[PDB]
Design an enzyme around this catalytic site. Structure first.
Site, PDB file in Angstrom:
ATOM      1  N   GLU A 162      -6.882  -5.307  -5.204  1.00  0.00           N
ATOM      2  CA  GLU A 162      -7.815  -4.513  -4.496  1.00  0.00           C
ATOM      3  C   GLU A 162      -8.395  -3.180  -5.207  1.00  0.00           C
ATOM      4  O   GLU A 162      -8.665  -2.217  -4.572  1.00  0.00           O
ATOM      5  CB  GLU A 162      -6.914  -4.276  -3.025  1.00  0.00           C
ATOM      6  CG  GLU A 162      -6.475  -5.573  -2.531  1.00  0.00           C
ATOM      7  CD  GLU A 162      -6.299  -5.698  -0.892  1.00  0.00           C
ATOM      8  OE1 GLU A 162      -5.615  -4.727  -0.711  1.00  0.00           O
ATOM      9  OE2 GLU A 162      -6.233  -6.797  -0.460  1.00  0.00           O
ATOM     10  N   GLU A 281      -6.002 -13.520  -0.782  1.00  0.00           N
ATOM     11  CA  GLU A 281      -5.237 -13.149   0.421  1.00  0.00           C
ATOM     12  C   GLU A 281      -6.043 -13.125   1.545  1.00  0.00           C
ATOM     13  O   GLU A 281      -7.270 -12.929   1.382  1.00  0.00           O
ATOM     14  CB  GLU A 281      -4.892 -11.576   0.165  1.00  0.00           C
ATOM     15  CG  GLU A 281      -4.099 -10.993  -0.999  1.00  0.00           C
ATOM     16  CD  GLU A 281      -4.020  -9.489  -0.773  1.00  0.00           C
ATOM     17  OE1 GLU A 281      -3.972  -9.069   0.301  1.00  0.00           O
ATOM     18  OE2 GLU A 281      -3.613  -8.868  -1.879  1.00  0.00           O
TER      19      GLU A 281
END
Length: 357
Positions: A162, A281
């Site tokens: 991320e 995810e």
């Protein structure tokens, strides 16, 4: 190769019983790929788990003089050796954007910087990250004899979980860092796929706007991520994106359709570039006022029907122990996203979809 996958972040510091539980659960459910953390940066983070990987610059493993500690490379070695036996492939992520397990801010603290994004720009930081990644990629697994560089159970390296760079909304800082680090990893290991591990944000692409006008920041470049530019890098083999409408400002009645547009937009872009794409995810909070299983079904159907290469839910857990054990003996659902190998409609859906992909 197309798949149902999942995530688990504790495979580098928990016990054999707990690691075997996750991997056996993955095998039982038909989950073919598990995305795990390959980092534990900073002495306080290492001490908190009594497990060491990178507690200080140039220290890889347990500091000389500390006894009775776990070595996170040994725990990762056990996880890899067990995944190999059980037929589970692994994606191993090499640093966190966030502060959990130290992350980029831990590197910035070591090198006396003043902002998280110094991680991408300070050459002393960049050098330390490469030194860590080279140590890990070259590490010989103590249970197999095979260095991670040569281990087919590892499916891919990912640069950074991320990653964001809010201080450079042009996207150029991240493009340059990803070029440098993905080429570096290919120079160490010509065998494995490399991906970024980002959430998939866009940077004001003509004709791409969010469903319902919500979470425009994920489409307008606010985080410094230009996903299309990152995916076009020669030394990046596949695109990654994440999906958390409840975190990003989407209303509950729009979770399903916002996520559906997000999936459609990422698959359209990656197909035009001509590289594989993984939704690596996704999650809806257990307590959302919508049917979570029905949203998951929608999103997995879209990945499957549009020709996406994989869909991986956050997150799979197994049996718990000690202070991480809930009312049923499982590792607790701390964030509202946990799935375990039980009779829940989510667990049943994952088993059903693992038969299709």
């Amino acid at each position: 190769f197309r798949f149902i996958g999942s995530n688990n972040y504790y495979m580098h510091y928990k016990s054999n019983r707990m690691i075997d539980s996750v991997l056996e659960s993955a095998r039982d459910m038909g989950i073919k790929v598990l995305r795990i953390w390959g980092f534990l940066d900073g002495e306080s983070y290492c001490r908190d788990k009594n497990t060491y990987m990178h507690p200080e610059p140039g220290v890889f493993g347990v500091p000389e003089g500390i006894s009775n500690a776990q070595n996170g490379f040994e725990r990762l070695d056990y996880t890899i050796a067990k995944a190999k036996e059980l037929g589970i492939k692994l994606i191993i992520v090499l640093v966190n954007n966030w502060d959990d397990f130290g992350g980029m801010n831990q590197y910035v603290r070591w090198f006396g910087g003043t902002h998280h994004d110094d991680f991408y720009r300070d050459e002393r930081i960049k050098e330390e990250y490469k030194k860590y990644v080279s140590f890990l990629i070259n590490h010989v697994n103590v249970y197999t004899g095979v260095p991670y560089r040569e281990e087919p159970t590892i499916m891919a390296w990912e640069l950074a979980n991320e990653l964001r760079c809010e201080t450079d909304k042009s996207g150029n800082t991240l493009v340059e860092w990803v070029k440098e680090m993905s080429s570096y990893i290919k120079s160490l290991d010509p065998n494995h796929l490399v991906a970024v591990g980002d959430e998939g944000f866009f940077s004001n692409y003509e004709g791409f706007k969010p469903y319902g006008g919500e979470a425009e920041w994920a489409y307008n470049g606010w985080s410094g991520v230009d996903w299309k530019k990152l995916l076009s890098i020669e030394t990046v083999d596949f695109g990654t994106f994440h999906l958390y409408p409840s975190h990003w400002g989407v209303s509950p009645e729009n979770y399903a359709q916002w996520g559906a547009k997000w999936i459609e937009d990422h698959i359209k872009i990656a197909k035009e570039i001509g590289k594989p794409v993984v939704l690596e995810e996704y999650g809806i909070p257990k307590s959302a006022p919508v049917n979570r299983t029905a949203i998951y079904r929608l999103w997995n159907d879209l990945v499957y029907d549009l020709g996406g290469d994989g869909a991986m839910f956050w997150m799979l857990a197994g049996i718990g122990e000690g202070s991480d054990r809930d009312e049923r003996g499982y590792y607790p659902d701390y964030d509202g996203f946990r799935i375990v190998n039980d009779d829940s409609p989510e667990a049943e859906l994952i088993r059903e979809y693992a038969k299709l992909f």
